[PDB]
Write a protein that binds this ligand. Structure first.
Ligand SMILES: COc1ccc2cc(-c3c(-c4ccncc4)nc(-c4ccc(S(C)(=O)=O)cc4C)n3C)ccc2c1
Length: 268
């Protein structure tokens, strides 16, 4: 249903500005002409027909995800050789972008929240037989309320990649969670220093990576990191399992986040 064809998205949406620039395009901000809703948009000019035919399934999936911690899709359109996709506006921005804005990493209370919610959001997906395949700071979004919104942004280096997936199975995401934590914890992920080539290999021969300044953080955090960053996919735990861990089982309030977001709304 949700993918319209032979309607110009400019008839339903105005573009009021840009947000940055990635790799399969720029990020646009957009205002629903008739209903007022703000959106973030993504345009994709396609070479092939299958290329497109494939993204159309991606999207109809996102359509069946009604969760409080996953972005909602607000409309999608093929028109004049291009394909636009309109996601819920999250005015706290992406997490990575905050760290870069504040020039710093997250505190533990703040990581705790983000993790808590990513876990709840993952559990949902895996329970719908769905993999995300692409967890990172950059796909974790923010409301002012201080809730996350998990975002796909497409389905180019991959530090958050799992071991079993190299050089070349829900459990892959969980690994990528673990890295993202470290990412938020240190702005940059492990092996940032390296060449995209050598990362892959580095992730393979390397022991599970740990935190850079270990006595800066709790037992609960690392004990959580350690058990999530299992290189065997089999002995690596599920979403729900991790949700029972103390690091996140205690977490009821997003204040820590929320205040972070508010800070960034002032530095801007
Ligand atoms: C498949 O449809 C889409 C369309 C637009 C998308 C935009 C983003 C996004 C958004 C976003 C911002 C506000 N509300 C929603 C999203 N922000 C970013 C983003 C992420 C990182 C950075 S940064 C400073 O680290 O270069 C900047 C932006 C704008 N992305 C990739 C993320 C996923 C998106 C997905």
């Amino acid at each position: 249903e949700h993918v319209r064809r032979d309607l110009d998205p400019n008839e339903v949406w105005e573009i009021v500005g840009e947000l940055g620039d990635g790799a399969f395009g720029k990020v646009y901000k957009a205002k629903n002409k008739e209903t007022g809703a703000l959106a973030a948009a993504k345009v994709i000019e396609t070479k092939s027909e299958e290329e497109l035919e494939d993204y159309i399934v991606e999207i109809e999936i996102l359509a069946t995800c009604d969760h409080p911690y996953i972005v909602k899709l607000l409309g999608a359109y093929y028109h004049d050789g291009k394909l636009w996709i309109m996601i819920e506006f999250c005015p706290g921005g992406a997490v990575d972008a905050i760290m870069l804005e504040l020039d710093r990493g997250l505190t533990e209370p703040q990581i705790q929240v983000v993790c808590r919610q990513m876990l709840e959001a993952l559990n949902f997906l895996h329970s719908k037989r769905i993999i995300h395949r692409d967890l990172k700071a950059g796909n974790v979004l923010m409301t002012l309320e201080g809730d996350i919104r998990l975002a796909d942004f497409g389905v180019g280096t991959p530090y958050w990649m799992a071991p079993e997936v190299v050089m070349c199975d829900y459990k892959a995401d969980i690994w990528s969670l673990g890295i993202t934590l470290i990412e938020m914890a240190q702005i940059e992920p492990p092996h940032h220093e390296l060449n995209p080539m050598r990362v892959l290999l580095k992730i393979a021969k390397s022991d599970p990576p740990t935190l850079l300044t270990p006595s800066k953080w709790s037992v609960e955090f690392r004990d959580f990191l350690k058990i999530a960053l299992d290189k065997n996919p089999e002995t690596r735990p599920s979403a729900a399992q991790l949700l029972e861990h103390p690091f996140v089982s205690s977490i009821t309030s997003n204040k820590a986040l929320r205040e972070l977001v508010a800070e960034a709304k002032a530095e801007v």
